[PDB]
Amino acid sequence: MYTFVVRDENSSVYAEVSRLLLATGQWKRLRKDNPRFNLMLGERNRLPFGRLGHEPGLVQLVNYYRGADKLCRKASLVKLIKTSPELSESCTWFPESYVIYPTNLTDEREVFLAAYNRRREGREGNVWIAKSGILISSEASELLDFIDEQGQVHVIQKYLEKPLLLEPGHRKFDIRSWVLVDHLYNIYLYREGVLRTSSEPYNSANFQDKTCHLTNHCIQKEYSKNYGRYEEGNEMFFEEFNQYLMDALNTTLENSILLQIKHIIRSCLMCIEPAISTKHLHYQSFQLFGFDFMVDEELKVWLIEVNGAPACAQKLYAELCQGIVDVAISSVFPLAPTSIFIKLHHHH
Amino acid sequence: MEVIELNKCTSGQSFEVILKPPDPSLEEIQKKLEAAEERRKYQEAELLKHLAE
Amino acid sequence: MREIVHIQAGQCGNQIGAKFWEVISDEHGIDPTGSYHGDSDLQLERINVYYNEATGNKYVPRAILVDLEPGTMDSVRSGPFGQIFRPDNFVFGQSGAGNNWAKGHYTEGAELVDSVLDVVRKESESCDCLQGFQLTHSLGGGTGSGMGTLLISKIREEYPDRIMNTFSVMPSPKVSDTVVEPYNATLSVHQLVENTDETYCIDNEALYDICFRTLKLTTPTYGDLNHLVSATMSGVTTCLRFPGQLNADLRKLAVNMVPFPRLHFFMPGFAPLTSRQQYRALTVPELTQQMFDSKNMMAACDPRHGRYLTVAAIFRGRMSMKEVDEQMLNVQNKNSSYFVEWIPNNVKTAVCDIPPRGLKMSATFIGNSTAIQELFKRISEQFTAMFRRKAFLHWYTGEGMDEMEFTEAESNMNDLVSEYQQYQD
Amino acid sequence: MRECISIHVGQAGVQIGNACWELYCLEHGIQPDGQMPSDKTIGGGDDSFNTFFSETGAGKHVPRAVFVDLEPTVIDEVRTGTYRQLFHPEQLITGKEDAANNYARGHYTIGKEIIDLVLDRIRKLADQCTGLQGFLVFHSFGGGTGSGFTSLLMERLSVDYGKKSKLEFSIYPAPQVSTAVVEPYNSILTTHTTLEHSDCAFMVDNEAIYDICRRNLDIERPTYTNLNRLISQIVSSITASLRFDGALNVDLTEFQTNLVPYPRIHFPLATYAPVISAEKAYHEQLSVAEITNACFEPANQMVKCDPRHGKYMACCLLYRGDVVPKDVNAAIATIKTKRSIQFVDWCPTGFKVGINYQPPTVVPGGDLAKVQRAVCMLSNTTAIAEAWARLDHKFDLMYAKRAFVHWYVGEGMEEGEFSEAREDMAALEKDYEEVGVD
Numbered sequence A: 001m002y003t004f005v006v007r008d009e010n011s012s013v014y015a016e017v018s019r020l021l022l023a024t025g026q027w028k029r030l031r032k033d034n035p036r037f038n039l040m041l042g043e044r045n046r047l048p049f050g051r052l053g054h055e056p057g058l059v060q061l062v063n064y065y066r067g068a069d070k071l072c073r074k075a076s077l078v079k080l081i082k083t084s085p086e087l088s089e090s091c092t093w094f095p096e097s098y099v100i101y102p103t104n105l106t107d108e109r110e111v112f113l114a115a116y117n118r119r120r121e122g123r124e125g126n127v128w129i130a131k132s133g134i135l136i137s138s139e140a141s142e143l144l145d146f147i148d149e150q151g152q153v154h155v156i157q158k159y160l161e162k163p164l165l166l167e168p169g170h171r172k173f174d175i176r177s178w179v180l181v182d183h184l185y186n187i188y189l190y191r192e193g194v195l196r197t198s199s200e201p202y203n204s205a206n207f208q209d210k211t212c213h214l215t216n217h218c219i220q221k222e223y224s225k226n227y228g229r230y231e232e233g234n235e236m237f238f239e240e241f242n243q244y245l246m247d248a249l250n251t252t253l254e255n256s257i258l259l260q261i262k263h264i265i266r267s268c269l270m271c272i273e274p275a276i277s278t279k280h281l282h283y284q285s286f287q288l289f290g291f292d293f294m295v296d297e298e299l300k301v302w303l304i305e306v307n308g309a310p311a312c313a314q315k316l317y318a319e320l321c322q323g324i325v326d327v328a329i330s331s332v333f334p335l336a337p338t339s340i341f342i343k344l345h346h347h348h
Numbered sequence B: 001m002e003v004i005e006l007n008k009c010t011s012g013q014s015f016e017v018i019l020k021p022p023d024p025s026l027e028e029i030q031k032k033l034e035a036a037e038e039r040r041k042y043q044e045a046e047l048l049k050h051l052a053e
Numbered sequence C: 001m002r003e004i005v006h007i008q009a010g011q012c013g014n015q016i017g018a019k020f021w022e023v024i025s026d027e028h029g030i031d032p033t034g035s036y037h038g039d040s041d042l043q044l045e046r047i048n049v050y051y052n053e054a055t056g057n058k059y060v061p062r063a064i065l066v067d068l069e070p071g072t073m074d075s076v077r078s079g080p081f082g083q084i085f086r087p088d089n090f091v092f093g094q095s096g097a098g099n100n101w102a103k104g105h106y107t108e109g110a111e112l113v114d115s116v117l118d119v120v121r122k123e124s125e126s127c128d129c130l131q132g133f134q135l136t137h138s139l140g141g142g143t144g145s146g147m148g149t150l151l152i153s154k155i156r157e158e159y160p161d162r163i164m165n166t167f168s169v170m171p172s173p174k175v176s177d178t179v180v181e182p183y184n185a186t187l188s189v190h191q192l193v194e195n196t197d198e199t200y201c202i203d204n205e206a207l208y209d210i211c212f213r214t215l216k217l218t219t220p221t222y223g224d225l226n227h228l229v230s231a232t233m234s235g236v237t238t239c240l241r242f243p244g245q246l247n248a249d250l251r252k253l254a255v256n257m258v259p260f261p262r263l264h265f266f267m268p269g270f271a272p273l274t275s276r277q278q279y280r281a282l283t284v285p286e287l288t289q290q291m292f293d294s295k296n297m298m299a300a301c302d303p304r305h306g307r308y309l310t311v312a313a314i315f316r317g318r319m320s321m322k323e324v325d326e327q328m329l330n331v332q333n334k335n336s337s338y339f340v341e342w343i344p345n346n347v348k349t350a351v352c353d354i355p356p357r358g359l360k361m362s363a364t365f366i367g368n369s370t371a372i373q374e375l376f377k378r379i380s381e382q383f384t385a386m387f388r389r390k391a392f393l394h395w396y397t398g399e400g401m402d403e404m405e406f407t408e409a410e411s412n413m414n415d416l417v418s419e420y421q422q423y424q425d
Numbered sequence D: 001m002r003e004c005i006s007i008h009v010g011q012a013g014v015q016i017g018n019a020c021w022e023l024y025c026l027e028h029g030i031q032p033d034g035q036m037p038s039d040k041t042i043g044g045g046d047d048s049f050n051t052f053f054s055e056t057g058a059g060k061h062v063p064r065a066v067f068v069d070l071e072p073t074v075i076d077e078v079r080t081g082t083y084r085q086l087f088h089p090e091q092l093i094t095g096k097e098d099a100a101n102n103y104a105r106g107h108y109t110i111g112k113e114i115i116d117l118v119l120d121r122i123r124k125l126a127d128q129c130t131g132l133q134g135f136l137v138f139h140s141f142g143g144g145t146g147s148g149f150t151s152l153l154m155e156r157l158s159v160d161y162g163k164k165s166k167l168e169f170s171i172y173p174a175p176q177v178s179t180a181v182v183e184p185y186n187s188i189l190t191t192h193t194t195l196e197h198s199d200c201a202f203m204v205d206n207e208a209i210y211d212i213c214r215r216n217l218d219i220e221r222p223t224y225t226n227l228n229r230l231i232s233q234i235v236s237s238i239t240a241s242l243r244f245d246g247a248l249n250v251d252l253t254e255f256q257t258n259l260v261p262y263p264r265i266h267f268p269l270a271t272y273a274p275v276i277s278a279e280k281a282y283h284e285q286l287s288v289a290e291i292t293n294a295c296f297e298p299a300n301q302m303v304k305c306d307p308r309h310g311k312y313m314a315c316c317l318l319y320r321g322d323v324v325p326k327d328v329n330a331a332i333a334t335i336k337t338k339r340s341i342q343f344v345d346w347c348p349t350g351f352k353v354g355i356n357y358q359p360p361t362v363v364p365g366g367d368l369a370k371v372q373r374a375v376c377m378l379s380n381t382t383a384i385a386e387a388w389a390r391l392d393h394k395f396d397l398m399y400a401k402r403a404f405v406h407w408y409v410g411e412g413m414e415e416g417e418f419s420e421a422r423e424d425m426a427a428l429e430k431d432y433e434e435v436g437v438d
């Protein structure tokens, strides 16, 4: 009889995983403070990793990789990419980014202005985006002044001015990929992705109205007037998207986009493996990751950010959550296909 | 990767590698000991007082 | 040299104490005449804990036999090992106590108590470093209950910093001699709450159920009940009588078992308990499953009705110490809802190489569980069923007691029940 | 030459002390009768091994050690054991009844009545020293004597020997080989009162030693003898610089200079490799890079924690056996390119390396196999704060209910000393966090 605790009640993903575990009749839930557990569905912030793996006779496992915040933080990611030789500053799939601390607090202010002034003189497109409350502008004076008005670290990266626009509609979008890394640091990519599309036509002559520029599911469902017009919930799945790429562009999702996505996932996760691997550790870790990509009109894929506690699409909750139990939990705590994942082999 | 202060002798050697540059007095202790000895005495007296009743 | 002084009082106390010395004397290779004839040095390593060494290599139990009637102690002196006890350590009167707590505590017992303390003082003066005392007695009678707790009160007055330990037989209507047993038990329990560090609660109904249902004894006798107590007393004292690090002495045992001074009443248990299919080998998992099973417990309290504050387990015999840790950790990790979560690692396990007589291996269980409140609830309800009509009180007011003393003992036990209740939530 | 005096307190301290001095004797060629055929100066000398051994006119080499226990059963083993001849009776001090795993009982009740006797026996050893460096104090956290009496002894030692260094070897409590529920209380009580009196403390977590014995030595159920012989190898590697010719950590003061830049953060992490089973057919001898690389594996640390998520303030490499500086630097380079070694910005990123050519000595009939080279890494990592967090958590669980507190108040301790000690640990955890996290 395996035992687990739940320390993040807001997690929709692991609320289902906990629902499935109990359904097997072989897992038992304990109070969130009972140390005698096999599996911890831990909190998001300040997870006490130092208390794991010190219970005699219990193989303990947790759904978070200590140190993965280096990849799932805006500022941390930019630093990781610029400082890690495995990724290099010349990394071609990540937008030119800079970490900017507000003046009320190293900092890449002057380095950003140098590249900014270079684009301005070269007649090139010089539209940047600041985030950490988002601002899209083509004037460096507005981007910096907006960050000074705040009090947290921000990042300024190049705004993909030539995104791939779906038709009909002429609308932006982004791609979410769920990736599961198990205790053995196998990188599993969920076969099912989701495109969070904008229901408003993309407009390059007005970054003030950010409804057609930001593809967030919450912004399209609150400030957009065409929500749910083209696809249910501004969510197009891979089957539809692949068929589109064939009818319009005469190519496949696998060839034009998915190869780059798998390459980016491997590069990011293999880079930090020596720092977060639990191979020789007194406890074991696994973690679900949410990768967000951008596709430009050249069919080039760009990495936007990595989410450490992602949510799943309503239609894909059952399949993925069950897949989490199979490869992540039962692999360490077996019970008494055609896998839904895609193993990205690599050298450990 | 620099090696400095190499000291060699018959039974070994030592050196240094640099990869990158950068109370209560005796009186007060007796008081604490006697203060705790006093709290024990008071507790035992209350116990004996209780047993005398 | 951490000597323990043993005291047995009243009929029940002397008959159970006699069997206790019978069992452990056999384990240490001591024959009825006090001569050693074992074959393992582990028998004498800690022998002086319970025995004095006389001339001629004679080992004399450090025990004091107390009663207000001669009868039972004449039987002990004529019993199997009756000749092994120091003759001067028989202290007895002639009046008896008529199952009357007041007679044992205030009148008949008061006249005899000083002479018992003289023998206790004598045994202590010859102890290199006295650990403390252990008393065997019942609570439903008059001598063991009333004079027994009077002895404890006066021993704690003369040895205030020594550990006081008792094996206390709790009365049950199903195995009862008189209707006044709840009166005598309620008066004693308050004494024990105040003046003992550890009390092993033994319920006669539990001993009866075990003999009848588990051991398949059609008509259990007091003798059969005392067989269980003997085996249990031998198990819980193995930590003291043989070399070991856990629960080595009485004070360390209390320090790990008693998180609150008044909650020091334990549920003991023993395994195996087999009827006569008695030669079958018992695996470690089976030993552990049964040892925690309510049917193997002798306080007649369901552990599933409370939570364990602390637990001490003693495994005896050549067995897989690794396999013991696995099953112990398995029981805790399979029922962690019955263990308080605010005392980390509150389940301790000790091993002993020498098994009991006639067994390849066994396990003795010592639990400090809030379920023990059920035992004091039963006694309290029986007390109140009679006290509300002042039934049978004249036996006690005739000895100079007042009704007020009963009302206070009643409230004292209900406070104890309430104290257990706050820690069960 | 400057003498060092070793003090062993409680069962853990005494049994570990017995295993260390057994190893010391085998390392220096000292026989159980105290004789040392290789010492050509009879009845005296100022050699490196004389920091730990005095000499009589008869040629006996006597440890500069005191054993203290509030109960005699453990120290009686020493009085009748193999090396009974080494010590004279003044060095072995035993009371009648122990502290019952009760810090207050060891510190106040029993400690008050035997402390002056212990200081008098230490003073006798000090009077034989022409230039005493300080003291090495061995004790457990969980025991009533190791916790309670040790802290009292340290307070007095700071009073009688103000300018003398004091190092600790402390045994961190692990339930797998523990039977006392109150050891978190004792651990935190003795850390609070000892913190200002200890210049450098090497914590050994029994949990770690236990698993190294099961994993590397293939011992299904390790005993204290197994644990202690492994611990004495690590202790030996740490004290070798004081007992042999050398230039690194030549006196107790250098331990603080090289390992403790901030006084309260004086708990270095020890990592040791290789630990090879003697029952093995015959193991492939590991290289300098392989044993060095193992110093950054959690599996061979004396305290289970993850240095990848802390910051280093200092790092010492102590090699024994066939090792030349060339190989050490080569391995260090290869490790910086693969490992996550983050130093605090106000400390240089480097390693102090000591090499003793004599390979580790193994006790005949022990569990460890003879190895051609071994290393012990001493690093001051903020990651060791995980052990304070674990410990302070268990403390909070029991103290919220005042469980077992009456045992301490009953021995004369005030309840407010609990919260006072806990607040000091909370401040200690804060110190580590300010130094390691961003």
Ligand SMILES: Nc1nc2c(ncn2[C@@H]2O[C@H](COP(=O)(O)OP(=O)(O)OP(=O)(O)O)[C@@H](O)[C@H]2O)c(=O)[nH]1
Residues within 6 Å of the ligand: D009, D010, D011, D012, D013, D015, D016, D069, D070, D098, D099, D100, D101, D102, D106, D140, D141, D142, D143, D144, D145, D146, D147, D171, D172, D173, D174, D177, D178, D179, D180, D183, D206, D224, D227, D228, D231
């Ligand atoms: N590594 C190791 N740990 C030990 C040894 N002996 C005891 N311990 C640990 O020390 C703790 C118990 O404290 P002890 O040293 O035995 O107690 P004490 O110092 O003698 O103090 P008292 O309570 O008076 O007995 C537990 O965590 C034990 O696991 C030993 O020989 N080696």
Ligand SMILES: Nc1ncnc2c1ncn2[C@@H]1O[C@H](COP(=O)(O)OP(=O)(O)CP(=O)(O)O)[C@@H](O)[C@H]1O
Residues within 6 Å of the ligand: A095, A129, A131, A157, A158, A159, A160, A161, A172, A173, A174, A213, A214, A215, A216, A292, A294, A304, A305, A307
């Ligand atoms: N450099 C860039 N070029 C073009 N679009 C960008 C961009 N950076 C961000 N975006 C837009 O912003 C949206 C994602 O913003 P971001 O992910 O940084 O905020 P967020 O983290 O709060 C949303 P989530 O974490 O759920 O993916 C995408 O829809 C994308 O269209």
Ligand SMILES: Nc1nc2c(ncn2[C@@H]2O[C@H](COP(=O)(O)OP(=O)(O)O)[C@@H](O)[C@H]2O)c(=O)[nH]1
Residues within 6 Å of the ligand: C009, C010, C011, C012, C013, C015, C016, C097, C098, C099, C100, C138, C139, C140, C141, C142, C143, C144, C145, C169, C170, C171, C172, C175, C176, C177, C181, C204, C207, C222, C223, C225, C226, C229
């Ligand atoms: N287990 C057991 N219980 C007994 C025995 N004799 C009496 N009792 C119980 O003890 C109580 C009577 O006390 P008893 O010892 O006979 O009176 P005392 O001589 O005045 O102490 C009743 O609850 C009896 O059931 C015995 O031999 N074994």
Ligand SMILES: CC(=O)N[C@@H]1CNc2ccccc2C1
Residues within 6 Å of the ligand: C097, C098, C099, C100, C180, C395
């Ligand atoms: C509980 C109690 O005291 N019962 C009495 C004991 N002694 C006695 C003597 C003579 C006649 C009756 C009795 C009954």
Ligand SMILES: [Ca+2]
Residues within 6 Å of the ligand: C111
């Ligand atoms: Ca009379």
Ligand SMILES: [Ca+2]
Residues within 6 Å of the ligand: D039, D040, D041, D042, D043, D044, D045, D046, D055
């Ligand atoms: Ca000499």
Ligand SMILES: [Ca+2]
Residues within 6 Å of the ligand: B023, D158, D162, D196, D197
């Ligand atoms: Ca000092």
Ligand SMILES: [Mg+2]
Residues within 6 Å of the ligand: A305, A307
């Ligand atoms: Mg985000």
Ligand SMILES: [Mg+2]
Residues within 6 Å of the ligand: C011, C012, C141, C177
């Ligand atoms: Mg009777």
Ligand SMILES: [Mg+2]
Residues within 6 Å of the ligand: D010, D011, D071, D098, D143, D145
């Ligand atoms: Mg001890």
